[PDB]
Amino acid sequence: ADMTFWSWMSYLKELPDIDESRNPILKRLLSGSFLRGSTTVNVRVPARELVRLLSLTPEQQREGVSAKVRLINLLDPKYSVYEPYLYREILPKRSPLLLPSLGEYRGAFLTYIFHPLSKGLVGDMLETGRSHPDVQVLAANMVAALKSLHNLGLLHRSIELNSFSVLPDGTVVLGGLDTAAPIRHTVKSDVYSLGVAFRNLVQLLGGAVRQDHLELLDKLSQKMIEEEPGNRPTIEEIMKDPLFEGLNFEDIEEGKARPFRY
C-alpha cells in the first residue's frame, strides 16, 4: 500500500532511538566520505553496547553485524524509512531465503538497519574465484528466494547476482529489498533480471561446478531473457525445468540448501 508524506514522516518518528555517541559507526563515516543510496558499515567485532541493543547471541557476536545507513531527508522521509517499514510491517520476522534484519533504528540524521555480517555477495564471490558452488542448487536457491518474495505480493525490481549473499551458516538469501514494491514492472521483469543474473553466473564459471549443469542453466537463462515478456516462463514453469529434477524444492524453501559446501 502507498502512503502519504505525513504517514512516512510519522513512521520515521516511530522508529526507536540508537545512541550514536556510544557507537563507532558515526566515527567511521566522519573519518571518510563514505556516505553516498545506502552505505554499508561492517562491524566484525560488536562492542558491549551494540550486543545489548541487538540482543546478540554469542554465535551472532562471533559472526559480526553490518549496518545499512541512510541520510534522513526531511523533504522525502520515504527514501530513509521505506526499507525499515518493509522489514517491520510487511516481511515475516524470518522468511528463510530473505536477508534478515536484526533491528531498525533512527539517530539524529541517519536511519539504520542491522544485518548479520555476510560471508560475501554471490557475484563478488564467484568473480574472485573464491568459491565453486553446486550450480544446480544455487540456481534453485535463487529462484526459490524470488518466489518467496512474490508470494508476499512484492516484486524485487533490481535483481542481480550481488542481490544474493551468503550468511555465516551458509544459507544463500535475497537482499537489496529497498527497491521492492507491490505487484511497468511485473513478475516477468523479475524473471528477465534473474535470467540476466544466471547468464552472469554462467559467464563467470565457464569443485562442485559441473559442465552439464552449466549448459542446462545457459538454456534456461536464454528462455528467461526473451525480449517479449509473454515468451518468458513463469516461476512455476522455471521450477519444473530439467535442471532442477531430483531436487526437493520444499527443503530449498525451508533454507536447508548449502550450495557453497563441498
Numbering used by the authors: 68 to 103, 106 to 252, 285 to 307, 317 to 372
What do the authors report?
These WNG kinases are conserved throughout the coccidian family of parasites to which Toxoplasma belongs and are secreted into the PV. Like WNG1, BPK1 is secreted into the lumen of the PV and is a clear member of the WNG family. As such, BPK1 shares both primary identity and predicted secondary structure with other WNG kinases throughout its sequence, indicating that its structure would provide faithful insight into the WNG kinase fold.
While we were unable to crystallize an active WNG kinase, we readily obtained crystals of the Toxoplasma pseudokinase BPK1 (bradyzoite pseudokinase 1). We solved the structure of BPK1 to 2.5-Å resolution. The BPK1 structure revealed a divergent kinase fold in which the Gly-loop and the first β-strand that stabilizes it (β1 in PKA nomenclature) have been replaced by a helical extension that packs against the top of the N-lobe of the kinase. Notably, the lack of the Gly-loop and β1-strand creates an active site that is much more open than that of a canonical kinase, such as PKA. While BPK1 is a confirmed pseudokinase that cannot bind nucleotide, the other canonical motifs essential for catalysis have been conserved in other WNG family members, suggesting they may be active kinases. To better understand how the WNG kinase active site has adapted to bind nucleotide and catalyze phosphoryl transfer without a Gly-loop, we modeled the WNG1/ROP35 active site using the structure of BPK1 as a template.
